[PDB]
Paper text:
The Mad1‐Mad2 complex, which is required to catalyse MCC formation, is targeted to kinetochores through a direct interaction with the phosphorylated conserved domain 1 (CD1) of Bub1. Mad1CTD is comprised of an N‐terminal elongated coiled‐coil, followed by a globular head domain featuring a conserved RWD (RING, WD40, DEAD) domain. Each monomer contains a long N‐terminal α‐helix (α1) forming the stem, followed by an antiparallel β‐sheet of four β‐strands (β1–4), a short helix (α2) and two C‐terminal helices (α3/α4). Bub1CD1 is largely a single α‐helix, consisting of almost four turns.
The highest resolution crystal structure, belonging to space group P212121, diffracted to 1.75 Å, with one Mad1CTD‐Bub1CD1 complex per asymmetric unit. In the crystal structure, two Bub1CD1 peptides are bound to the Mad1CTD homodimer. Unexpectedly, the peptide binding interface lies diagonally across the Mad1CTD coiled‐coil, making contacts with both Mad1CTD monomers. The start of the CD1 helix begins with the phosphothreonine residue (pThr461), contacting the coiled‐coil of one monomer at the conserved Mad1 RLK motif, whereas its C‐terminus contacts the opposite Mad1 subunit at the top of the coiled‐coil and its adjoining head domain β‐sheet. Specifically, the phosphate group of pThr461 forms a direct interaction with Mad1 through a charged hydrogen bond with Arg617 of the conserved Mad1 RLK motif. Our structure further reveals that pSer459 does not contact Mad1; instead, it is part of the disordered N‐terminal tail of Bub1CD1. A striking feature of the pThr461 residue is its position at the start of the CD1 helix. Here, the phosphate group caps the N‐terminus of the helix, stabilizing the positively charged helix dipole with its bulky negative charge. In our crystal structure, where Bub1CD1 and Mad1CTD are co‐crystallized at concentrations over 100 times the KD and with a sevenfold molar excess of peptide, we see clear differential occupancy of the peptides in the electron density map and the 2Fo‐Fc omit map. Significantly, the side of the coiled‐coil which angles inwards comprises the binding site of the higher occupancy peptide, whereas the lower, partial occupancy peptide binds to the outside of the bend.
Numbering used by the authors:
A (entry chain B): 597 to 668, 673 to 718
B (entry chain D), D (entry chain C): 457 to 477
C (entry chain A): 597 to 718
């Protein structure tokens, strides 16, 4: 019937509208969430083209300095130009302490100390 | 306070629930 | 019934399924990002019902211990620490790093290291 | 070789967009 045809055409538009909205509010929310995680923790967390996590510090001293972590429950730090400059931090906190959070926290404080003015 | 349209509220109700754990 | 009604039902079905996959795909990658931020930074960052940000430490002493930050405005980058039961216990860290230094990352870094040292085996 | 159904692949095209820079 034209009756059912008209009711269904409206349903299709409604269904498409629900999906379209799901796209827009997701976009805004994660960019809000991404900006919040960056301002709070001090690290830019990017999921790279290999399902890897590349991190950039708010206090990075040179553009391009980054840390790359590989995922498998445990996460392995991979080799980067900046990885070599902090071998000392990696030894204390990643191996002895077995704590990525203690590692990144110590790095942030060290980078913040050298970022200061005057 | 125009009010969000039903399609904007429904999507926001589930998207914000996924950010809470 | 009619082929026109059929074709429209299959479109309704198709859209209500795009739905089901956008949710499930938005479902894993959101958690992927958050659980990654947790494993890496040591903070579980939730979005509260008021669109504020609740942080729980991987090394929290009690499960309800948390910090809550709020964004002052969407068109800005400032953020402010709101009072919680746990924030009552770290007034010295707040004074040094949030008030005197004005650095949330330095604050959470110092708090992470302090909580890590407190969580002894025995 | 499990695959990607069309509705699943279509949601991944918009999903990953906001996880960089």
């Amino acid at each position: 019937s034209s009756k059912e045809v008209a009711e269904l055409k409206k349903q299709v538009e409604s269904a498409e509208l629900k999906n379209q909205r799901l796209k827009e509010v997701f976009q805004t929310k994660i960019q809000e969430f991404r900006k919040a995680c960056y301002t709070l923790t001090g690290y830019q967390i990017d999921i790279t083209t290999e399902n890897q996590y590349r991190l950039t510090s708010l206090y990075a001293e040179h553009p391009g300095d980054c840390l790359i972590f590989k995922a498998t429950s445990k996460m392995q730090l991979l080799e980067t130009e900046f990885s070599h400059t902090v071998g000392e931090l990696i030894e204390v906190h990643l191996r002895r302490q077995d704590s990525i959070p203690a590692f990144l926290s110590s790095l942030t404080l060290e980078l913040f100390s050298r970022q200061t003015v005057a | 306070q125009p009010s969000p349209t039903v399609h904007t509220k429904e999507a926001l109700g589930f998207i914000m629930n996924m950010f809470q754990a």
